[PDB]
Short mmCIF file of N, CA and C and ligand atoms in Angstrom, two decimals:
data_model
loop_
_atom_site.label_atom_id
_atom_site.label_comp_id
_atom_site.label_asym_id
_atom_site.label_seq_id
_atom_site.Cartn_x
_atom_site.Cartn_y
_atom_site.Cartn_z
N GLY A 1 79.78 35.07 -79.20
CA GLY A 1 79.84 33.80 -78.10
C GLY A 1 78.84 33.08 -77.42
N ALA A 2 78.62 33.43 -76.18
CA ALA A 2 77.13 33.29 -75.63
C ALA A 2 76.30 34.30 -76.49
N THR A 3 76.90 35.34 -77.07
CA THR A 3 76.17 35.98 -78.09
C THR A 3 75.77 35.15 -79.43
N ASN A 4 76.78 34.25 -79.84
CA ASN A 4 76.35 33.45 -80.97
C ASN A 4 75.22 32.46 -80.67
N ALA A 5 75.31 31.77 -79.72
CA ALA A 5 74.27 30.89 -79.24
C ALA A 5 72.94 31.32 -78.95
N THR A 6 73.05 32.60 -78.36
CA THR A 6 71.74 33.42 -77.99
C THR A 6 71.11 33.93 -79.13
N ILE A 7 72.02 34.34 -80.31
CA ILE A 7 71.30 34.77 -81.53
C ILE A 7 70.74 33.45 -82.23
N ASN A 8 71.34 32.39 -82.17
CA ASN A 8 70.81 31.23 -82.56
C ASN A 8 69.43 30.51 -82.21
N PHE A 9 69.34 30.74 -80.76
CA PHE A 9 68.08 30.38 -79.89
C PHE A 9 67.07 31.19 -80.37
N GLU A 10 67.47 32.65 -80.38
CA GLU A 10 66.32 33.58 -80.59
C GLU A 10 66.12 33.52 -82.24
N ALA A 11 66.66 33.14 -83.03
CA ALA A 11 66.24 32.70 -84.31
C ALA A 11 65.20 31.58 -84.49
N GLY A 12 65.60 30.57 -83.65
CA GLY A 12 64.47 29.63 -83.56
C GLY A 12 63.17 30.06 -82.90
N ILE A 13 63.24 31.02 -82.05
CA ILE A 13 62.16 31.40 -81.29
C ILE A 13 61.40 32.46 -82.20
N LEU A 14 61.91 33.06 -83.14
CA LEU A 14 61.37 33.91 -84.23
C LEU A 14 60.68 32.97 -85.32
N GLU A 15 61.30 31.94 -85.50
CA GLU A 15 60.67 30.94 -86.49
C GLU A 15 59.48 30.40 -85.80
N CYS A 16 59.19 30.09 -84.69
CA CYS A 16 58.14 29.85 -84.01
C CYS A 16 57.18 30.88 -83.94
N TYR A 17 57.36 31.91 -83.71
CA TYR A 17 56.30 33.06 -83.75
C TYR A 17 55.76 33.32 -85.07
N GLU A 18 56.59 33.11 -85.90
CA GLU A 18 56.28 33.09 -87.50
C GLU A 18 55.15 32.01 -87.72
N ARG A 19 55.69 30.78 -87.41
CA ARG A 19 54.77 29.43 -87.47
C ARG A 19 53.54 29.75 -86.71
N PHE A 20 53.47 30.19 -85.62
CA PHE A 20 52.27 30.43 -84.83
C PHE A 20 51.28 31.52 -85.80
N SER A 21 52.11 32.61 -86.22
CA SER A 21 51.23 33.70 -86.79
C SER A 21 50.70 33.19 -87.97
N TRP A 22 51.30 32.28 -88.80
CA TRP A 22 50.98 31.70 -90.13
C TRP A 22 49.62 30.85 -89.62
N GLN A 23 49.46 30.21 -88.56
CA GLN A 23 48.35 29.52 -88.27
C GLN A 23 47.09 30.58 -87.61
N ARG A 24 47.36 31.89 -87.64
CA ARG A 24 46.31 32.81 -87.15
C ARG A 24 46.19 32.61 -85.66
N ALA A 25 46.95 32.27 -84.83
CA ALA A 25 47.11 32.28 -83.35
C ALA A 25 47.61 33.38 -82.79
N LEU A 26 48.42 34.00 -83.54
CA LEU A 26 49.22 35.10 -82.77
C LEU A 26 48.58 36.55 -82.98
N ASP A 27 48.18 37.18 -81.77
CA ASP A 27 47.47 38.03 -81.73
C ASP A 27 47.98 39.51 -82.01
N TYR A 28 47.50 40.49 -82.20
CA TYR A 28 48.11 41.80 -82.78
C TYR A 28 49.22 42.21 -82.05
N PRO A 29 49.13 42.46 -80.62
CA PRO A 29 50.31 42.85 -79.91
C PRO A 29 51.65 41.67 -80.33
N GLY A 30 51.13 40.49 -80.34
CA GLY A 30 52.06 39.44 -80.54
C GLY A 30 52.69 39.63 -81.89
N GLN A 31 52.06 39.89 -83.02
CA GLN A 31 52.41 40.09 -84.13
C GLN A 31 53.55 41.27 -84.04
N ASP A 32 53.18 42.52 -83.45
CA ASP A 32 54.08 43.63 -83.23
C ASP A 32 55.45 43.00 -82.63
N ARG A 33 55.11 42.21 -81.59
CA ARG A 33 56.30 41.50 -80.94
C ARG A 33 57.07 40.96 -81.75
N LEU A 34 56.42 40.08 -82.67
CA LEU A 34 57.25 39.26 -83.85
C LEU A 34 57.96 40.32 -84.65
N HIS A 35 57.37 41.35 -85.16
CA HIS A 35 58.11 42.35 -85.93
C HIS A 35 59.34 43.20 -85.28
N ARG A 36 59.33 43.16 -84.06
CA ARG A 36 60.37 43.84 -83.27
C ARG A 36 61.52 42.81 -83.21
N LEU A 37 61.22 41.60 -82.78
CA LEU A 37 62.20 40.68 -82.66
C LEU A 37 62.92 40.36 -83.98
N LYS A 38 62.20 40.23 -85.15
CA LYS A 38 62.72 40.09 -86.56
C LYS A 38 63.81 41.21 -86.78
N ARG A 39 63.37 42.43 -86.71
CA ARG A 39 64.13 43.70 -86.99
C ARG A 39 65.48 43.54 -86.10
N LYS A 40 65.27 43.34 -84.83
CA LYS A 40 66.41 43.25 -83.95
C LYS A 40 67.51 42.33 -84.13
N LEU A 41 66.85 40.99 -84.29
CA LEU A 41 67.85 39.99 -84.84
C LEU A 41 68.54 40.05 -86.23
N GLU A 42 67.86 40.76 -87.03
CA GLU A 42 68.35 40.95 -88.16
C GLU A 42 69.78 41.94 -87.96
N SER A 43 69.52 42.83 -87.37
CA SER A 43 70.73 44.00 -86.82
C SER A 43 71.73 43.25 -86.05
N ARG A 44 71.38 42.26 -85.11
CA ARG A 44 72.05 41.65 -84.35
C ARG A 44 72.98 40.62 -85.20
N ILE A 45 72.37 40.15 -86.08
CA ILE A 45 73.05 39.13 -87.03
C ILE A 45 73.98 39.89 -87.96
N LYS A 46 73.65 40.80 -88.40
CA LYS A 46 74.50 41.73 -89.42
C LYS A 46 75.87 42.12 -88.84
N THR A 47 75.74 42.59 -87.38
CA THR A 47 76.92 42.93 -86.56
C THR A 47 77.76 41.84 -86.28
N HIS A 48 77.26 40.75 -85.81
CA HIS A 48 78.09 39.69 -85.26
C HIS A 48 78.83 38.99 -86.48
N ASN A 49 78.14 38.94 -87.47
CA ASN A 49 78.61 38.30 -88.85
C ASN A 49 79.74 39.09 -89.25
N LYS A 50 79.76 40.58 -89.27
CA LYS A 50 80.59 41.49 -89.63
C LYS A 50 82.00 41.37 -88.81
N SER A 51 81.88 40.78 -87.72
CA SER A 51 83.16 40.70 -86.83
C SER A 51 83.74 39.38 -86.88
N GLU A 52 83.50 38.51 -87.74
CA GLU A 52 83.95 37.11 -87.71
C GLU A 52 84.58 36.99 -89.23
N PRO A 53 85.46 35.92 -89.60
CA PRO A 53 85.84 35.56 -90.79
C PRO A 53 84.67 35.13 -91.64
N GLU A 54 84.88 35.08 -92.92
CA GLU A 54 83.86 34.71 -94.04
C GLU A 54 83.31 33.31 -93.61
N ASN A 55 84.10 32.40 -93.21
CA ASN A 55 83.53 30.85 -92.86
C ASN A 55 82.69 30.84 -91.72
N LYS A 56 82.78 31.83 -90.74
CA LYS A 56 82.10 31.74 -89.57
C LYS A 56 80.81 32.84 -89.55
N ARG A 57 80.17 32.84 -90.70
CA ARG A 57 79.12 33.71 -90.99
C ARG A 57 78.10 32.98 -91.22
N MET A 58 76.79 33.28 -90.73
CA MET A 58 75.42 32.50 -91.04
C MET A 58 74.31 33.36 -91.30
N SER A 59 73.52 33.18 -92.24
CA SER A 59 72.58 33.99 -92.47
C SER A 59 71.27 33.69 -91.40
N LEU A 60 70.24 34.52 -91.56
CA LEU A 60 69.21 34.22 -90.55
C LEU A 60 68.57 32.89 -90.68
N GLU A 61 68.37 32.55 -91.98
CA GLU A 61 67.89 31.20 -92.32
C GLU A 61 68.41 30.01 -91.66
N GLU A 62 69.76 29.93 -91.91
CA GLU A 62 70.51 28.91 -91.35
C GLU A 62 70.51 28.86 -89.66
N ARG A 63 70.42 30.19 -89.35
CA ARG A 63 70.49 30.03 -87.79
C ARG A 63 69.05 29.84 -87.20
N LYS A 64 67.90 30.00 -88.10
CA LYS A 64 66.80 29.48 -87.66
C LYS A 64 66.52 27.88 -87.32
N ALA A 65 67.31 27.39 -88.38
CA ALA A 65 67.26 25.85 -88.38
C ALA A 65 68.17 25.50 -87.08
N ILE A 66 69.13 26.02 -86.59
CA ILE A 66 69.81 25.82 -85.54
C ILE A 66 69.03 26.08 -84.29
N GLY A 67 68.34 27.14 -84.22
CA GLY A 67 67.49 27.44 -83.04
C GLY A 67 66.27 26.48 -82.81
N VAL A 68 65.49 26.14 -83.92
CA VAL A 68 64.49 25.18 -84.02
C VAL A 68 65.06 23.82 -83.42
N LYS A 69 66.41 23.34 -83.56
CA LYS A 69 66.79 22.28 -83.17
C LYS A 69 67.10 22.37 -81.79
N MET A 70 67.61 23.47 -81.28
CA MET A 70 67.98 23.72 -79.96
C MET A 70 66.68 23.63 -79.15
N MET A 71 65.58 24.26 -79.60
CA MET A 71 64.26 24.31 -79.16
C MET A 71 63.85 22.79 -78.77
N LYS A 72 63.80 22.03 -79.79
CA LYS A 72 63.44 20.52 -79.68
C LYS A 72 64.01 19.87 -78.61
N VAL A 73 65.52 20.09 -78.51
CA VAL A 73 66.34 19.52 -77.38
C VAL A 73 65.77 20.00 -76.15
N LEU A 74 65.92 21.20 -75.85
CA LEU A 74 65.31 21.64 -74.72
C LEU A 74 64.01 21.18 -74.13
N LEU A 75 63.16 20.82 -75.10
CA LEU A 75 61.65 20.50 -74.78
C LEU A 75 61.46 19.05 -74.76
N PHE A 76 62.82 18.49 -74.97
CA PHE A 76 62.93 16.91 -74.91
C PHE A 76 61.98 16.21 -76.13
N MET A 77 62.26 16.72 -77.25
CA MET A 77 61.62 16.38 -78.51
C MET A 77 62.70 15.95 -79.39
N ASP A 78 62.39 15.09 -80.33
CA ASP A 78 63.40 14.51 -81.44
C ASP A 78 63.93 15.86 -82.13
N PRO A 79 65.35 15.91 -82.15
CA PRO A 79 65.80 17.17 -82.74
C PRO A 79 65.56 17.09 -84.37
N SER A 80 65.16 16.17 -84.98
CA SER A 80 65.28 16.32 -86.49
C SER A 80 64.12 17.34 -87.12
N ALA A 81 64.82 18.00 -88.34
CA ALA A 81 63.95 19.01 -89.09
C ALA A 81 62.78 18.26 -89.47
N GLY A 82 61.66 19.01 -89.58
CA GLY A 82 60.47 18.36 -90.35
C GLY A 82 59.65 17.33 -89.58
N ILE A 83 58.62 16.97 -90.20
CA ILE A 83 57.79 15.95 -89.68
C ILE A 83 58.25 14.55 -89.79
N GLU A 84 59.34 14.34 -90.63
CA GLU A 84 59.96 13.03 -90.78
C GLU A 84 61.02 12.95 -89.79
N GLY A 85 61.24 11.56 -89.27
CA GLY A 85 62.34 11.45 -88.38
C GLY A 85 61.82 10.96 -87.01
N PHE A 86 60.79 10.98 -86.64
CA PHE A 86 60.35 10.36 -85.17
C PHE A 86 60.84 8.97 -85.05
N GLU A 87 61.31 8.61 -83.65
CA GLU A 87 61.20 7.35 -83.46
C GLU A 87 59.88 6.70 -82.89
N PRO A 88 59.77 5.51 -82.92
CA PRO A 88 58.44 4.79 -82.47
C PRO A 88 58.17 5.00 -81.02
N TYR A 89 59.33 5.02 -80.02
CA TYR A 89 59.04 5.00 -78.69
C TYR A 89 59.78 6.13 -78.11
N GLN B 1 49.83 42.78 -91.43
CA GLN B 1 49.35 41.76 -90.18
C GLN B 1 48.23 40.80 -90.62
N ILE B 2 48.39 39.81 -89.89
CA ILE B 2 47.30 38.71 -90.21
C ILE B 2 46.14 38.88 -89.09
N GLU B 3 44.91 38.78 -90.06
CA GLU B 3 43.69 38.98 -89.27
C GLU B 3 43.35 37.63 -88.40
N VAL B 4 43.12 37.78 -87.12
CA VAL B 4 42.76 36.57 -86.16
C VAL B 4 41.50 36.94 -85.41
N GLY B 5 40.97 35.72 -84.94
CA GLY B 5 39.84 35.50 -83.99
C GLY B 5 40.06 35.83 -82.53
N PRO B 6 39.10 35.97 -81.54
CA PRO B 6 39.34 36.43 -80.26
C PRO B 6 39.99 35.09 -79.59
N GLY B 7 40.09 33.95 -80.10
CA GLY B 7 40.72 32.83 -79.54
C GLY B 7 42.26 33.03 -79.37
N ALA B 8 42.82 34.19 -80.25
CA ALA B 8 44.11 34.33 -80.29
C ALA B 8 44.81 34.89 -78.89
N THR B 9 43.98 35.78 -78.22
CA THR B 9 44.41 36.38 -76.99
C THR B 9 44.92 35.18 -76.17
N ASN B 10 44.01 34.48 -75.52
CA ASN B 10 44.32 33.24 -74.79
C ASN B 10 45.62 32.26 -75.46
N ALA B 11 45.48 32.08 -76.71
CA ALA B 11 46.54 31.24 -77.39
C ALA B 11 47.92 31.89 -77.29
N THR B 12 47.96 33.17 -77.35
CA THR B 12 49.12 34.05 -77.36
C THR B 12 50.04 34.04 -76.23
N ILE B 13 49.09 34.30 -75.18
CA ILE B 13 49.48 34.11 -73.67
C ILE B 13 50.24 32.68 -73.44
N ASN B 14 49.47 31.74 -73.92
CA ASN B 14 49.76 30.33 -73.72
C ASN B 14 51.16 29.94 -74.45
N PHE B 15 51.12 30.50 -75.67
CA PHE B 15 52.14 30.40 -76.63
C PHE B 15 53.46 31.03 -76.01
N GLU B 16 53.22 32.23 -75.55
CA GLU B 16 54.31 33.04 -75.01
C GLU B 16 54.72 32.40 -73.53
N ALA B 17 54.03 31.78 -72.82
CA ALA B 17 54.37 31.05 -71.77
C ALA B 17 55.25 29.76 -72.18
N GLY B 18 55.04 29.17 -73.21
CA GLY B 18 55.82 28.15 -73.81
C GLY B 18 57.30 28.75 -74.26
N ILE B 19 57.18 29.82 -74.89
CA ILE B 19 58.48 30.68 -75.14
C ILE B 19 59.22 31.03 -73.97
N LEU B 20 58.64 31.39 -72.91
CA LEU B 20 59.34 31.58 -71.62
C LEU B 20 60.10 30.50 -71.14
N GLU B 21 59.30 29.19 -71.03
CA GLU B 21 59.75 28.09 -70.68
C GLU B 21 60.98 27.77 -71.32
N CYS B 22 61.11 27.90 -72.82
CA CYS B 22 62.23 27.64 -73.57
C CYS B 22 63.26 28.55 -73.20
N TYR B 23 63.13 29.74 -72.93
CA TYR B 23 64.36 30.54 -72.57
C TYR B 23 64.69 30.03 -71.35
N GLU B 24 63.89 29.84 -70.36
CA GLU B 24 64.50 29.38 -68.89
C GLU B 24 65.26 27.98 -69.13
N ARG B 25 64.76 27.08 -69.95
CA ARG B 25 65.75 25.87 -70.25
C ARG B 25 67.02 26.20 -70.87
N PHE B 26 67.11 27.23 -71.68
CA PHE B 26 68.31 27.48 -72.43
C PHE B 26 69.20 28.42 -71.49
N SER B 27 68.64 29.21 -70.59
CA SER B 27 69.35 29.81 -69.57
C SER B 27 70.35 28.88 -68.68
N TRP B 28 69.84 27.73 -68.30
CA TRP B 28 70.66 26.64 -67.55
C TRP B 28 71.84 26.21 -68.42
N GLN B 29 71.65 26.13 -69.71
CA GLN B 29 72.96 26.15 -70.58
C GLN B 29 74.01 27.48 -70.20
N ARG B 30 73.75 28.09 -69.22
CA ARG B 30 74.37 29.53 -69.06
C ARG B 30 74.83 30.14 -70.59
N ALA B 31 73.99 29.90 -71.69
CA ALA B 31 74.44 30.17 -72.97
C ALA B 31 73.86 31.69 -73.17
N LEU B 32 72.95 32.28 -72.15
CA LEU B 32 72.16 33.31 -72.52
C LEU B 32 72.85 34.64 -71.88
N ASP B 33 73.20 35.51 -72.77
CA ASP B 33 73.86 36.73 -72.62
C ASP B 33 73.04 37.81 -72.06
N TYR B 34 73.56 38.80 -71.53
CA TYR B 34 72.83 40.00 -70.68
C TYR B 34 71.60 40.42 -71.28
N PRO B 35 71.69 41.03 -72.50
CA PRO B 35 70.39 41.32 -73.26
C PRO B 35 69.39 40.24 -73.38
N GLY B 36 69.78 39.00 -73.23
CA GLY B 36 68.91 37.73 -73.37
C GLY B 36 68.18 37.46 -72.05
N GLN B 37 69.08 37.72 -71.03
CA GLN B 37 68.54 37.62 -69.62
C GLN B 37 67.54 38.65 -69.31
N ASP B 38 67.68 39.78 -69.97
CA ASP B 38 66.77 40.87 -69.56
C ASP B 38 65.62 40.77 -70.50
N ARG B 39 65.62 40.27 -71.64
CA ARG B 39 64.54 39.89 -72.38
C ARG B 39 63.61 38.70 -71.81
N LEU B 40 64.11 37.61 -71.09
CA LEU B 40 63.41 36.77 -70.46
C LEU B 40 62.63 37.13 -69.17
N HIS B 41 63.36 38.05 -68.44
CA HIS B 41 62.96 38.66 -67.03
C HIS B 41 61.48 39.62 -67.41
N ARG B 42 61.68 40.34 -68.41
CA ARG B 42 60.79 41.26 -68.90
C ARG B 42 59.56 40.52 -69.37
N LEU B 43 59.87 39.34 -70.28
CA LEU B 43 58.87 38.46 -70.64
C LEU B 43 58.11 37.97 -69.57
N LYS B 44 58.71 37.24 -68.63
CA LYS B 44 58.07 36.69 -67.39
C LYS B 44 57.10 37.70 -66.68
N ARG B 45 57.66 39.23 -66.56
CA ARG B 45 57.01 39.94 -65.88
C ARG B 45 55.66 40.41 -66.30
N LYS B 46 56.01 40.62 -67.79
CA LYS B 46 54.81 41.04 -68.67
C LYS B 46 53.67 40.03 -68.70
N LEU B 47 54.22 38.83 -68.93
CA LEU B 47 53.19 37.67 -69.16
C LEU B 47 52.42 37.50 -67.70
N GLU B 48 53.17 37.42 -66.56
CA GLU B 48 52.45 37.46 -65.38
C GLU B 48 51.22 38.54 -65.31
N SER B 49 51.49 39.77 -65.75
CA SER B 49 50.46 40.92 -65.69
C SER B 49 49.42 40.48 -66.72
N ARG B 50 49.75 40.10 -67.78
CA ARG B 50 48.72 39.61 -68.74
C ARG B 50 47.73 38.66 -68.45
N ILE B 51 48.38 37.53 -67.52
CA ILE B 51 47.70 36.31 -67.02
C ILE B 51 46.70 36.84 -65.95
N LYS B 52 47.15 37.72 -65.16
CA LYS B 52 46.32 38.16 -64.12
C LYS B 52 45.16 38.85 -64.62
N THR B 53 45.52 39.71 -65.70
CA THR B 53 44.33 40.76 -66.34
C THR B 53 43.57 39.81 -67.24
N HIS B 54 43.85 38.87 -67.83
CA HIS B 54 43.04 38.08 -68.79
C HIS B 54 42.16 37.10 -67.69
N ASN B 55 42.77 36.53 -66.66
CA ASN B 55 42.01 35.61 -65.91
C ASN B 55 40.97 36.25 -65.02
N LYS B 56 41.15 37.54 -64.79
CA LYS B 56 40.25 38.48 -64.08
C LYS B 56 39.26 38.74 -65.05
N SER B 57 39.48 38.63 -66.24
CA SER B 57 38.56 38.89 -67.26
C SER B 57 37.53 37.81 -67.72
N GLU B 58 37.76 36.39 -66.94
CA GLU B 58 37.20 35.16 -67.39
C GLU B 58 36.27 34.70 -66.37
N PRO B 59 35.46 33.78 -66.61
CA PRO B 59 34.66 33.09 -65.52
C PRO B 59 35.37 32.80 -64.33
N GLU B 60 36.24 31.59 -64.38
CA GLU B 60 36.73 31.15 -63.12
C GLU B 60 37.15 29.64 -63.36
N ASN B 61 36.23 28.95 -63.92
CA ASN B 61 36.77 27.73 -64.59
C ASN B 61 37.51 27.80 -65.76
N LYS B 62 37.73 28.96 -66.36
CA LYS B 62 38.77 28.99 -67.32
C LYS B 62 39.97 29.73 -67.01
N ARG B 63 40.18 29.94 -65.77
CA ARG B 63 41.35 30.62 -65.20
C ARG B 63 42.48 29.67 -65.14
N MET B 64 43.84 30.10 -65.47
CA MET B 64 44.90 29.12 -65.53
C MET B 64 46.12 29.80 -64.98
N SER B 65 46.73 29.34 -64.29
CA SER B 65 48.10 29.73 -63.87
C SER B 65 49.21 29.81 -64.81
N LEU B 66 50.27 30.47 -64.57
CA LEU B 66 51.35 30.46 -65.63
C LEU B 66 51.81 29.09 -65.72
N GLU B 67 52.08 28.15 -64.71
CA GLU B 67 52.48 26.79 -64.91
C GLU B 67 51.64 26.10 -65.64
N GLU B 68 50.25 26.07 -65.81
CA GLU B 68 49.24 25.41 -66.51
C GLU B 68 49.37 25.96 -67.83
N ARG B 69 49.47 27.32 -68.18
CA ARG B 69 49.58 28.01 -69.54
C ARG B 69 50.86 27.57 -70.17
N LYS B 70 51.99 27.53 -69.32
CA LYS B 70 53.47 26.83 -70.01
C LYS B 70 53.08 25.43 -70.52
N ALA B 71 52.20 24.65 -69.84
CA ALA B 71 51.74 23.34 -70.19
C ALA B 71 51.38 23.18 -71.81
N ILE B 72 50.27 24.13 -71.77
CA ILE B 72 49.72 24.34 -73.10
C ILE B 72 50.57 24.96 -74.00
N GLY B 73 51.36 25.82 -73.85
CA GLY B 73 52.28 26.31 -74.69
C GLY B 73 53.19 25.49 -75.40
N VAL B 74 53.90 24.51 -74.65
CA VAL B 74 54.61 23.42 -75.05
C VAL B 74 54.09 22.49 -75.70
N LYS B 75 52.64 22.27 -75.42
CA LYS B 75 51.95 21.38 -76.48
C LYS B 75 51.85 21.91 -77.87
N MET B 76 51.49 23.32 -77.87
CA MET B 76 51.62 24.03 -79.18
C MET B 76 52.91 23.76 -79.75
N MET B 77 54.08 24.19 -78.97
CA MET B 77 55.26 24.21 -79.52
C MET B 77 55.63 22.79 -80.17
N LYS B 78 55.14 21.79 -79.71
CA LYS B 78 55.50 20.43 -80.47
C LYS B 78 54.83 20.43 -81.78
N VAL B 79 53.55 20.98 -81.97
CA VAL B 79 53.05 20.93 -82.99
C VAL B 79 53.67 21.85 -84.28
N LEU B 80 54.06 23.02 -83.71
CA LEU B 80 54.48 24.07 -84.50
C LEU B 80 56.12 23.67 -84.84
N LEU B 81 56.95 23.09 -83.93
CA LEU B 81 58.23 22.67 -84.01
C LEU B 81 58.46 21.61 -85.17
N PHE B 82 57.52 20.77 -85.58
CA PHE B 82 57.61 19.96 -86.41
C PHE B 82 56.75 20.09 -87.85
N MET B 83 56.07 21.25 -88.17
CA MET B 83 55.36 21.55 -89.15
C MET B 83 56.16 22.81 -89.74
N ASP B 84 57.41 22.85 -90.56
CA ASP B 84 58.05 24.03 -91.28
C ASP B 84 57.55 24.45 -92.53
N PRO B 85 57.20 25.74 -92.74
CA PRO B 85 56.56 26.14 -93.86
C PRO B 85 57.29 26.36 -95.04
BR1 LIG C 101 74.88 27.55 -81.29
BR1 LIG C 102 44.16 41.87 -79.76
BR1 LIG C 103 54.81 42.43 -76.11
BR1 LIG C 104 63.53 26.48 -89.81
BR1 LIG C 105 58.56 19.25 -71.37
BR1 LIG C 106 59.29 13.75 -80.08
BR1 LIG C 107 67.92 17.49 -89.15
BR1 LIG C 108 68.79 15.14 -85.65
BR1 LIG C 109 61.58 22.19 -88.53
BR1 LIG C 110 57.69 19.80 -92.17
BR1 LIG C 111 65.79 8.45 -79.27
BR1 LIG C 112 44.84 38.00 -93.16
BR1 LIG C 113 38.65 32.23 -82.68
BR1 LIG C 114 45.18 27.87 -76.63
BR1 LIG C 115 60.42 36.41 -77.18
BR1 LIG C 116 68.64 34.26 -66.72
BR1 LIG C 117 58.48 30.58 -64.47
BR1 LIG C 118 44.54 30.69 -61.84
BR1 LIG C 119 51.92 29.42 -61.59
#
């Protein structure tokens, strides 16, 4: 529910920790935090997906893309994936 | 783990202050379940403590409040949000 939405949002959040860690900006307790979040969302995704029909199931990967989009919208940024898609103004 | 420089302390505080801002924005979608609300409140509480401790560890002209650090965090979040590996 609010559980699905919250999972997808948290999957975007995870993707951002990951991107930041890739750029060597995430500190060591931050990377512990990233590992806890990934394990926790994995277990939460397994459970949520097990309680829905086949066609209402989504991998972590798909969900990350959903949460990244949510994050863009909330921060008032163009919602399109990737570096392509900006408007001029 | 990934090896990082001393710059990552402040960067991670700023980053996480951007994260917190996002949770806060998402919350106003009432889309945030109880474990999500607890994660947000705990984030804010721990970040305030880290900010106070880090600021107390720095000159004065480098000290920054939570609201200033969120502003830095959101700047970083634009860059990150549009470069997908
Ligand atoms: Br959603
Ligand atoms: Br450290
Ligand atoms: Br932490
Ligand atoms: Br993604
Ligand atoms: Br903003
Ligand atoms: Br934009
Ligand atoms: Br898209
Ligand atoms: Br779009
Ligand atoms: Br993206
Ligand atoms: Br890209
Ligand atoms: Br537009
Ligand atoms: Br490394
Ligand atoms: Br550094
Ligand atoms: Br920074
Ligand atoms: Br978080
Ligand atoms: Br809340
Ligand atoms: Br706040
Ligand atoms: Br300050
Ligand atoms: Br403040």
